[PDB]
Design an enzyme around this catalytic site. Sequence first.
Site, PDB file in Angstrom:
ATOM      1  N   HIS A 138     -41.156 -65.715 -63.760  1.00  0.00           N
ATOM      2  CA  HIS A 138     -42.007 -64.545 -64.032  1.00  0.00           C
ATOM      3  C   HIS A 138     -43.463 -64.897 -64.148  1.00  0.00           C
ATOM      4  O   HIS A 138     -44.320 -64.070 -63.810  1.00  0.00           O
ATOM      5  CB  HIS A 138     -41.639 -63.951 -65.329  1.00  0.00           C
ATOM      6  CG  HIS A 138     -40.367 -63.181 -65.305  1.00  0.00           C
ATOM      7  ND1 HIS A 138     -40.058 -62.330 -64.312  1.00  0.00           N
ATOM      8  CD2 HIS A 138     -39.356 -63.083 -66.254  1.00  0.00           C
ATOM      9  CE1 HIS A 138     -38.880 -61.750 -64.581  1.00  0.00           C
ATOM     10  NE2 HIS A 138     -38.453 -62.206 -65.781  1.00  0.00           N
TER      11      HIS A 138
ATOM     12  N   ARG B   4     -24.478 -66.526 -64.532  1.00  0.00           N
ATOM     13  CA  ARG B   4     -23.812 -65.227 -64.248  1.00  0.00           C
ATOM     14  C   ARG B   4     -23.747 -65.025 -62.706  1.00  0.00           C
ATOM     15  O   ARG B   4     -24.375 -65.780 -61.939  1.00  0.00           O
ATOM     16  CB  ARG B   4     -24.561 -64.017 -64.856  1.00  0.00           C
ATOM     17  CG  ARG B   4     -25.151 -64.117 -66.265  1.00  0.00           C
ATOM     18  CD  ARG B   4     -25.552 -62.736 -66.828  1.00  0.00           C
ATOM     19  NE  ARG B   4     -26.935 -62.265 -66.529  1.00  0.00           N
ATOM     20  CZ  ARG B   4     -28.035 -63.028 -66.520  1.00  0.00           C
ATOM     21  NH1 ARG B   4     -27.966 -64.334 -66.784  1.00  0.00           N
ATOM     22  NH2 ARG B   4     -29.220 -62.494 -66.255  1.00  0.00           N
TER      23      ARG B   4
END
Length: 391
Positions: A218, A336
């Site tokens: 980010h 995930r």
Amino acid sequence: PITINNFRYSDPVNNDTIIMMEPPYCKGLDIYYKAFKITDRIWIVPERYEFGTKPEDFNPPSSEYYDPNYLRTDSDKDRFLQTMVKLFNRIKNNVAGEALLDKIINAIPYLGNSYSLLDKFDTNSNSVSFNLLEQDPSGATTKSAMLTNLIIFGPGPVLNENEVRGIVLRVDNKNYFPCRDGFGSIMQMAFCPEYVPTFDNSKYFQDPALILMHELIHVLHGLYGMQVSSHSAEELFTFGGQDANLISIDIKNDLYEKTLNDYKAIANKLSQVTSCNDPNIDIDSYKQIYQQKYQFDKDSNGQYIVNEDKFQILYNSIMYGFTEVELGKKFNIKTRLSYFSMNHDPVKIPNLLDDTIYNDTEGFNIESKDLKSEYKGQNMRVNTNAFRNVD
């Protein structure tokens, strides 16, 4: 070569790697916190992220886990700092993670923005500079200014919920982000290494180095002035994988055209720059850094222009070159499948500091413990001592 430095929270300030920093949202308010330069253009400030908060925002009200006394002591702060040092070493020791850091370090915020004077480099907004106290050879304590890329704080209210944000400038009664608009800014991180999420898809906890690197991605979007605004898309590009595929080609195209356009605007701005407000800045040296950063060509005139293909490669490496899924792969950390998973109770990692639980070349997945294979070191049914549940 990139060095991650070493320090003890109680070491004395030295005008170099340990200072008292006025964080950017404290500009001119003369509040200083002790800060530590982990590596060039990256600071760690071992304090709670408090900008725009009430002190009562910090208790459970009436997934989200709180504790108002986390990170308040010298001991707490020293633990946090040594932890961050280890997490940065863990990132740097794999070649993929060190390319990340190198790109973040190099992606310096442009010395101006959409509302800065067009022909001057402006080292004077809080979006590009913080103040510090410096200790003169004469005994006097003075106040100066510094350019940086990223400042990492401890968490806000919610411990297990890290955030990255560029600096907001107030301009004509509007919220403006130079990190959305090509220029970049100082990015600020609220980060907690102890509280990591869990998942299945047979249950696993996350390696904090990979939550860190997710946040650093980010930070990279933002230094390149490519934070994806209100879409969220920013979170899907960052995750990567098949999730990236959910941002429609229509939206990938507006984002791409929009960034292409900002860069054109910056190419034009860079051409006009003939002076700086700050005596210490070598105009021509910064022009070359920004040519390199934005991947501009020079035309026959002497003007900077966007070469389309070089822009496309650059864009590609910013949006697609670093994702959680790929970094997990390259580090051997289990991930995930998709951003969209019910968030199972996080868990605490009480001792990242001990090489028997977590080291900096392998994480939890230590092969001498036969915890490399099938990511057993992250498995909740196998590596039972590494975590603790939370109340």
